[PDB]
Structures are given as C-alpha cells and as structure tokens.
Enzyme design. Structure first.
Site, short mmCIF file in Angstrom:
data_model
loop_
_atom_site.label_atom_id
_atom_site.label_comp_id
_atom_site.label_asym_id
_atom_site.label_seq_id
_atom_site.Cartn_x
_atom_site.Cartn_y
_atom_site.Cartn_z
N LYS C 314 -26.40 -44.56 -14.33
CA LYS C 314 -25.74 -44.34 -13.05
C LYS C 314 -26.66 -43.78 -12.00
CE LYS C 314 -22.83 -41.63 -14.96
NZ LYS C 314 -23.38 -41.94 -16.31
N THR C 315 -27.36 -42.74 -12.43
CA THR C 315 -28.27 -42.00 -11.59
C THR C 315 -29.38 -42.91 -11.12
OG1 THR C 315 -29.92 -41.29 -13.22
CG2 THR C 315 -27.78 -40.18 -13.23
N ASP C 368 -26.12 -36.35 -8.27
CA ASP C 368 -26.03 -36.64 -9.68
C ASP C 368 -24.99 -35.71 -10.30
OD1 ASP C 368 -28.01 -37.39 -12.39
OD2 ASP C 368 -26.95 -35.49 -12.43
N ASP C 369 -24.34 -36.15 -11.37
CA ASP C 369 -23.47 -35.26 -12.13
C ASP C 369 -22.40 -34.52 -11.32
OD1 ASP C 369 -24.02 -35.64 -14.76
OD2 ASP C 369 -25.58 -34.10 -14.87
N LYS C 396 -15.27 -35.28 3.40
CA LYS C 396 -14.49 -35.54 4.60
C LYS C 396 -15.13 -34.97 5.89
CE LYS C 396 -10.05 -35.69 4.51
NZ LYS C 396 -9.88 -37.16 4.67
N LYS C 473 -29.03 -46.45 -21.43
CA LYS C 473 -29.89 -45.29 -21.60
C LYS C 473 -29.97 -45.06 -23.10
CE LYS C 473 -32.24 -41.62 -20.27
NZ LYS C 473 -32.30 -40.78 -21.50
#
Lengths: 343, 160, 502
Positions: C314-315, C368-369, C396, C473
């Site tokens: 993802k990162t 991240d995370d 927002k 990974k």
C-alpha cells in the site's frame, strides 16, 4: 501612553495618582473617514487625486484598523502610484500593503451558495426569520440555532452565509481547525476567549461548527470531552451583559447524539438541510455549477427520471469533478455509475 | 617582489612572485578535499573555479571515536600556523556581560585581520568541541551571525 | 539660490538648486516600490504626494534563502553611501544598563543627523541581523524608530528566519509598515541563481559539459539561494579533489537539503513488479485522481484511501503515486518518525507537516498507517481521540484560496475506518487486493526473476488452477526464505511456506 495595559504596575492605577484610565476605541466608521479624510483631503487639495477611490467606500470597507493604519494604507497606495509612474494603486495596496493585523467568509463559502433547490431558499429564508427574531427580542435575549444535515450537507457554508446576511457589528467565525491538537483545556480556553469577544457588540452573531467534531465526540465508546461539552452547555444557557445580545449557530452532522447529551434541548430552533432526493434538482445544480456541456446536462436529465438520488452538494460537486477528468464519452457513463455506487 | 622567509610584510597587488590517524583514510581524504582542495590550489585556479571558499566542517561521531585527535591533526596539517583556537564547551560562562559579547569577540579577531589584509593569505582556524552545549537563547543566535555575516568572514575555518 | 549648509534661511519656490541578483525580481520590484518612492522623485513630487517617508521594511525567509546578500546589495546601491550599518544579533551585550542604552545610542546618532539638517537630504540605512530575540531593550528599540518627534529620513531593514517569534507592535504600518516574505526560489528563478553562480565559472573556459543549469533546476526547486550557491560550491571540491558528469553524482552523495531529506527509495523498497494488470490499473487510476487534483478548481482538496492487508504494498503504491505526480510539494508522513510521541505531540507533528502544504500551490501528503496514528488495538477497543479528530479535521480542512492539497493514506483494514466513521470523510476508496490466483502469482515470480524457469514451472503446476492468498510484501520474504535452501529443495520450501501462508 502605552500599547498594553497589562504590563504596567497596579499601584499607580488606583484613583488618586492615576484615577482615570482610558482605553482607545475601535476606529469609528465616521472616524475612519476622518483620519483617511485628512490625508486624502490634503491630496484632494493638490490637483492629483484618484477618481475611483471614494472616502465613504474606503471607510465602509475597513472596520478594524487603528489610525496609523489609515496613513499606512494611504502611504502604500502612494508608493504603488509612484511605481505606476516608473482602485488603481489604492486597490493594489488594499490587495497587498497590509499586514493590517486584523471574519473572512470567503474561506467558508468556497462554492457560491447556488440555488439548486427550493430547500436551499427555504433554509435561508428561515435564517432571515431568525435574524428578524434577534433584531429586538427583549423577552428572550439570546438566540440559539442549529442546522442538522447528512455528512457533506454543506450546512456550514449556509450558516456562514446567514452570518454575512446578518451583518451584525461583530461576527467571529469558529473553526474546529484552530482547536486541532489542543489540550482539552486549551480547547476550552480559546473557545472561552471567543465567548467574551462576543460580549462587546450590542447585537451580535457567533458560529459554532462541526460540534460533534468540536466536542471530539467519537462513535466508539462513545468517547467525548466533558469539559468542552461544558463550556458548550453552559453557554447556550449563559447570558450576555444587559443590553448587548447574541445568536449562536451550530452545525451538527448527527442530530441524535447531540439530542442525547441534552444539547438539542438547549437550542431555541433546529433546522434541517437534507441532500436532494430529486434528479431534476440535481440537474439544476449541474446547470448552476456549469461543469458539463449542454449535451451532458440533457443526458443526465434523461438518466435521472425513474431514479432517486441521495447525495450531498459538497459530495455532489466532488463527484462531478471526479467524473469530469476522464474523457468525454466516459464522463456521462462514469458519472452515472459513480452515482449508482454512491446511492 | 616577494617577502622573505621570516618577514611579516603584507604585500598587495599582482607585482609579486600522513600521520597519525588509525583508520579513517578515504573519508579523511574527502573531508580533507572539500575544505583543503578549494584553498590549496595556487592561486588562479579558485578564480577559474570562481567559487568562494567554504567556511567550516562539522564532524559527529559516537563517543570514544577519538574525534578530538582527528581535529588536532587537521589543525596541525592545514596551516604552518593556524594558529589553532580552542573553545571551552560552556562558552556562555559569566552572567555579568558577557557571553554574547565574548562569542562575538572570539569570532571577531580573525575577521578583522582579514579585512585589514583581505585577499591573501591568512586563514584562521577556530575549533569547537561539545557543540550541543553551544546550541541557550540568544548566545546560540550570535554564532550564526558571524558565518552568514553581511560583510565577508571568508577564510576563517571552524570545526565542531 | 541655495541656503548655506543647513542655515536658518527659509527659502520657498522652484528658484532653488541592476546586478547582480537572481529571482524574486517581482518582489524586489515591490519592495523597491514602497521604500524608494518617497526618496526617488526629486523633489516636489513627494510634497504633492504629501506622505512622510517610510520608516522601515522587514524581510523574513526560510533559512538559506540568501536574505543577507540581498540586503547588503540593496543597501550599497540605494544611496551612494549610507554607508551600511551592521547589528550584532546580541545587540545589547554588557548587562549594565548604560551599555544597553549605548546599544540604543548607535540608532540615536542616526536619528540625529536629520535633526541637525532636517528637510533634505541625508540618508542612513541601518540593517539589523537576527532581529528575532531582539523587555526594556525592545521598548527602547521601538522608541528609536517612531516618535516622539520626527525621526524620518532614515530607513531600517530586519532579516529573520521566523515571523511568529517577532513582536506585534513593530509590524503595524508606521515603524515597520511593509513586511516582506521570501518564498523558496522559483524553478525559473532557481535557474537564474544556478546560471549566475555558474556563469563566473562559465565565463572562464573551464566547464563541465554534462552538467546543465536547467537539469539542476528541475532536480532541485527546494533549495534556497544560499544553498543553491553552496550546491555549486560542492561541485568544485570534486575537481579540486581529482587533481590531488562526476559532479552531479558527487552532488547526489552530498546535497543535505533539509527539504529533500525524505527519500522515496526508503518507501519503495522492493519496487513494483506487477503480479496483475489490475495492479497497474490501480496505479494509473491513482494517477488519474492526482491529475484530477491538478485540474480541478472548484475542488482543490483531495482524499484517497487505498486498502490492502498489512504487507499489501500500500505504502509503496502511495509512494509511486506521489512520484508520478511531479508536485512542487511532496511529503510523506509515517509513524516511524513519530515513534513514542505524546498523543498531543503527534498532533503537533501533523500540524507541522500539513501546515507547510497550504503555501504550496499543488501538493501531496502521504500518511502511512492511518490506523497507526489512531493506534487501534482490536481488543478493547482502544484508540486515541485527538489523533482521530486531527485526521478528520485535516481531511476536511481547506488550504487558503488559490491553493490545492491532496491527501493519501493507507489502512490495512476497512473495518477500522468504518468503526471510526472516518471512511465517510474520504472522497474515495481503492482496493489493493493481494494475489488470489495461481497464474498471476507465477507471473509475479517471472517479473521478480528469482527461481529458475523449470522450478518455477513445477511451482505453477503445483498452483495453476488452485487458489492462493499471499500479500506481495509477504511473497518477497517468502522467496528469500526459499532461496536459502539447496538448489534441490528450493521449491519444496517455497511450497511449504506458501501452504502455510495460505
């Protein structure tokens, strides 16, 4: 003569050695016209002048500025004019020069409050009804109002517009954003300072926004800040000094939790601003925004009939924009599909 | 003309004319190279380069890395006489005046010799140990000004 | 006619009597416009204007922007000779009060020169280095600029790293009417700075052919002038070094930018090999959303959430998205920097990273995370309110008008985001599925090129048709584990471990 009262010693202040302490007033509109008027007039007197610039207009434009500030604004205009030689200069100075050091609505109505729907007009007229209620209101000094909408309702831009419409002498915006990362106590404190600032004006409006957000209320638990809630709870009950009055607008995404904490009980009036359930209204909004081509509006119009839309304007505009980047054959289909998924 | 090998005569114009450190050699050469290389070439090369000499080099190491010895060696090696200048960590000692003024004072002399003689060929080295103590408040602010000082200050080398 | 040296004879009537700087040039023009206009026209125009000459101007820039050099240059050019006045940062040194008064006095003489001759035309320019860090001293400084009587016909410029540190009273028009802020040098501007510093080198025959000014400019837009100059200085050391192209590489092994510190090579550690055409489509879709951020005016603010099981890449995907954006401001936010921070502290770091983003016209910030920042623990459930509020609000939050902010965060589990109700806030959610089919897995293996072809075919035989569930990974770790075994049982090990990660 001194810039700050607080720095100086207490012993001098007591009646006797220094019986009277005088605090300089906020610049008068008429007064602002006087300070500007002398410099402008001296310029008037010499032949050169700027026709576009108007004394009354500059005064109406500026409320906050100290005297000096007036000379400063004028001086900057003069420098810009000099630059022209090697509105006009005055406008450029207004645009840049200050550095004034002192209510921006342009940050809260990013999207023009377009008349997508009959509901928009009704919510605003109701805002008008509320200000009229304020105007006198001797029997009830303090006005409390809230707006409840689905997330992305955009109720907050609306609240800001009501504040612009009202034009009460003192209006200060409240931001969740300023509060971020603050100690629960710090959060209470800033909020408090705004509360007293509201006191100075005779007729006055203040904005509270994203109260669920303001409170730090969280769905799991649920967990929330008792102290923040407290400042919030008492205030609605709390009374301004006699004479001077205030109207509080709170925007809340979720009605029931706030009702649950007795918060709803407090408000004088509650207003709802639901997302459009009609395709044609959606179309009207599209027309107002002017994003899709005159063909696309017709196509969307053909698709919407026989279909029900439950989407926020804030959300809708975001959706629109998302569909638009993709290529022209694609935009119609993608937007339809996206709408379908969102539904 | 050319000054004798024992003269202090400050002539101007253009009518003139490997031990010991265990390990740390390649690195020693690169570190050596950026400060020394710019300065060493005689003398037109720098103008051909047309680049002003760097002011200082900083080395950070785990404790016991014998950083101090390396500093002494660079001080010995760079100049016939730097003359080397050493700074106590406290720096800011003496409430009465003082420390700010003193910081500027230790800084000032090399620059003044240079302004009097600016062009060539005096380079002055001041060495800093326990920088963390050095950089509190304003005293920390003072050091910054001399390197980035509005006028000159080149040709003075500081190691921390 | 002309009265003798500042006499007492009041005479009336008319029967009397740009190199080298790089960038900031429009700004330079404005600063020229406010201070100079009173002085420049000789001499009735000012009375016609009728404005008392401006007292002082102050400039603040992020460090290394070469503020100082601009100040020295302007000071020498404006008046044949001021001749320049320099202030020590300490300014007040020597704590006896009389001495501090002396610190005041150096200003005091300057006010005086006008007093002896007031009308025209003596100008002294005093510039204070380190105006920040300036009590009695500050009030005192304040007096020697405005009032009680006169004190005009001199000007003072203050240079400082931070605006916020400074006192409010000076800022108001009058004593310091105009405040100037210096941005990081423009890319085109970066090219004038590189070009002019190079040019002295260039002018001489010696040059490095490979190096290109434009290339250096595209490579760093972040660097401040001092720093850009430093960058050119760095190149020389290599040539000098050689005597007792190359410069660009050497430059890479030494930039020390302080804004370029974040390394993408740190976040895209094993790179991307696409097990699936869909993984490419997802990256391209992310790019399209980035382009969306780039094109949109009515919607300058973007939030995208990409979710895969931990170790899903993802990162890395986020980093790639960031890479291909070419945004002038790219930053990545990780818990890794954050470790051990007080819940409030975490909010502070966030405030800083988000805070820079708004100034930049178009920018992307990667978190991240996201859950790590909330720090959800399944048992409990325990998470921190302030971090969550900060994230919801930040999503927002809108940058000031004329600005665009783009946010990307990665969360392994959708359930956390739904639990928070944070997920609703995001503009979009994109799936990052781990490999589920055998063939696709085989393809990933081909791209990575680890196993020999025959063993890979055997693996395919053992997986083709069947179902699998391994995060990419995880898969690399797995490949490594299996390559440590003898060439015989490298497949047995791979399959065993895969049968465990199924």
């Amino acid at each position: 003569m001194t810039n700050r009262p607080d720095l100086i010693d207490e012993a001098l202040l007591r009646p006797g050695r220094l019986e009277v302490k005088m605090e300089i007033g906020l610049p008068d509109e008429k007064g602002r016209l006087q300070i500007l008027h002398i410099h402008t007039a001296r310029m008037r007197g010499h032949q050169l002048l700027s026709a576009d610039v108007d004394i009354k207009e500059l005064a109406v434009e500026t409320k906050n500025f100290s005297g000096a500030e007036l000379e400063g604004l004028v001086r900057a205009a003069q420098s810009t004019a000099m630059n022209r030689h090697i509105d006009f200069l005055a406008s450029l100075e207004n645009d840049i020069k200050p550095a004034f050091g002192t209510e921006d609505y342009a940050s809260y109505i990013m999207n023009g409050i377009i008349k997508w729907g009959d509901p928009v007009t009704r919510v605003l007229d109701d805002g008008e009804l509320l200000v009229q209620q304020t105007k006198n209101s001797d029997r009830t000094p303090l006005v409390s109002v809230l707006l409840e909408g689905p997330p992305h309702s955009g109720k907050t831009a609306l609240a800001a517009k009501i504040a612009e419409e009202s034009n009460f002498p003192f209006i200060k915006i409240c931001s969740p954003d300023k509060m971020i990362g603050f100690s629960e106590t710090a959060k209470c404190q800033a909020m408090k300072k705004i509360f007293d600032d509201a006191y100075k004006s005779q007729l006055s409006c203040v904005v509270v926004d994203d109260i669920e957000r303001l409170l730090d209320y969280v769905p799991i638990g649920p967990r929330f800040s008792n102290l923040v809630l407290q400042a919030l709870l008492v205030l609605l009950k709390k009374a301004p000094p006699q004479g001077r009055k205030l109207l509080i607008i709170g925007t809340t995404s979720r009605k029931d939790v706030l009702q649950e904490m007795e918060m709803l009980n407090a408000f004088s009036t509650t207003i709802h601003v639901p997302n459009i359930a009609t395709g044609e209204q959606l179309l009207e909004a599209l027309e107002l925004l002017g994003n899709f081509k005159d063909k696309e509006r017709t196509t969307i119009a053909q698709q919407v009939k026989g279909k029900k839309v439950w989407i926020g304007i804030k959300k809708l505009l975001m959706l629109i924009e998302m569909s638009l980047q993709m290529d022209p054959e694609y935009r119609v289909r993608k937007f339809l599909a996206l709408l379908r998924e969102e539904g | 003309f050319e000054k004798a090998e024992n003269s202090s005569l400050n002539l101007i114009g253009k009518a003139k004319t490997k031990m010991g450190i265990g390990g740390l050699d390649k690195e020693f050469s690169d570190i050596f190279r950026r400060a020394f290389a710019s300065r060493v070439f005689p003398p037109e090369i720098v103008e051909q380069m047309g680049c002003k000499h760097v002011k200082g080099i900083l080395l950070y190491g785990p404790p016991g890395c014998g950083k101090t010895l390396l500093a002494r060696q660079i001080g010995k090696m760079l100049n016939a006489r730097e003359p080397k200048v050493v700074n106590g960590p406290e720096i800011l000692n003496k409430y009465v005046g003082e420390s700010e003024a003193n910081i500027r004072k230790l800084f000032a002399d090399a620059e003044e010799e240079q302004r009097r003689l600016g062009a060539n060929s005096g380079l002055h080295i001041i060495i800093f140990d326990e920088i963390d103590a050095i950089c509190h408040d304003t005293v920390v602010n003072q050091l910054l000004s001399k390197i980035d000082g509005v006028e000159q200050l080149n040709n003075i080398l500081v190691i921390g | 006619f002309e009265k003798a040296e500042n006499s007492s004879l009041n005479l009336i009537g008319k029967a009397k009597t740009k190199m080298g700087i790089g960038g900031l040039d429009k700004e330079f023009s404005d600063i020229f416009r406010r201070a100079f206009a009173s002085r420049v026209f000789p001499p009735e125009i000012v009375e016609q204007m009728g404005c008392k000459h401006v007292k002082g101007i102050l400039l603040y820039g992020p460090p290394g922007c070469g503020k100082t050099l601009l100040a020295r240059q302007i000071g020498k050019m404006l008046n044949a000779r001021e001749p320049k006045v320099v202030n020590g940062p300490e300014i007040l040194n020597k704590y006896v009060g009389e001495s501090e008064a002396n610190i005041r006095k150096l200003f005091a003489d300057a006010e005086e020169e006008q007093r002896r001759l007031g009308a025209n035309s003596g100008l002294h320019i005093i510039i204070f280095d380190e105006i920040d860090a300036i009590d009695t001293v500050v009030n005192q400084l304040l007096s020697k600029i405005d009032g009680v009587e006169q004190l005009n016909n001199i000007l003072v410029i203050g240079m400082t790293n931070r605006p916020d540190l400074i006192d409010e009273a000076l800022l108001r028009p009058g004593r310091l009417e105009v405040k100037m802020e210096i941005g990081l040098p423009d890319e085109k501007g970066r090219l004038q700075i590189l070009h002019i510093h190079t040019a002295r080198m260039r002018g001489h025959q010696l040059l490095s052919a490979d190096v290109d000014i434009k290339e250096l400019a595209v490579e760093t837009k972040n660097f401040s002038g001092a720093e850009l100059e430093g960058l050119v200085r760095a190149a020389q050391s290599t040539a000098m070094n050689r005597h007792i192209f190359l410069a660009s590489l050497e430059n890479d092994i030494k930039p020390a930018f302080g804004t370029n510190q974040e390394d993408y090579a740190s976040y895209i550690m094993n790179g991307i090999i696409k097990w699936g055409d869909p993984v490419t489509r997802v990256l391209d879709d992310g790019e399209l959303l980035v382009q969306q951020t780039k094109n949109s005016d009515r919607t300058p603010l973007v939030s995208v959430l990409l979710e895969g099981p931990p170790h899903s890449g993802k990162t890395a995907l986020a980093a790639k998205i960031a890479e291909e954006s070419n945004f002038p401001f790219i930053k990545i936010c990780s818990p890794d920097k954050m470790i051990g921070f007080s819940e409030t502290a975490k909010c502070q770091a966030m405030k800083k990273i988000f805070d820079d983003a708004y100034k930049s016209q178009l920018s992307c910030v990667v978190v991240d995370d996201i859950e790590r920042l909330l720090d959800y623990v399944p048992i409990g459930p325990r998470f921190s309110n302030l971090v969550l509020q900060a994230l919801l609000v930040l999503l927002k939050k809108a940058p000031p008008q004329g600005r665009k902010l783009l946010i990307i965060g990665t969360t392994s589990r959708k359930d956390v985001l739904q639990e928070m109700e944070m997920l609703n806030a995001f503009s979009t959610t994109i799936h990052v599925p781990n490999i589920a089919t055998g063939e696709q897995l085989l393809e990933a293996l081909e791209l990575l090129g680890n196993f020999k072809d025959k063993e890979r075919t055997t693996i395919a035989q053992q997986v083709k048709g069947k179902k699998v569930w391994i995060g990419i990974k995880k898969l690399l770790m797995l490949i490594e584990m299996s390559l440590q075994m003898d060439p015989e049982y490298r497949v047995r090990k791979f399959l065993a471990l895969l049968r465990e990660e199924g």
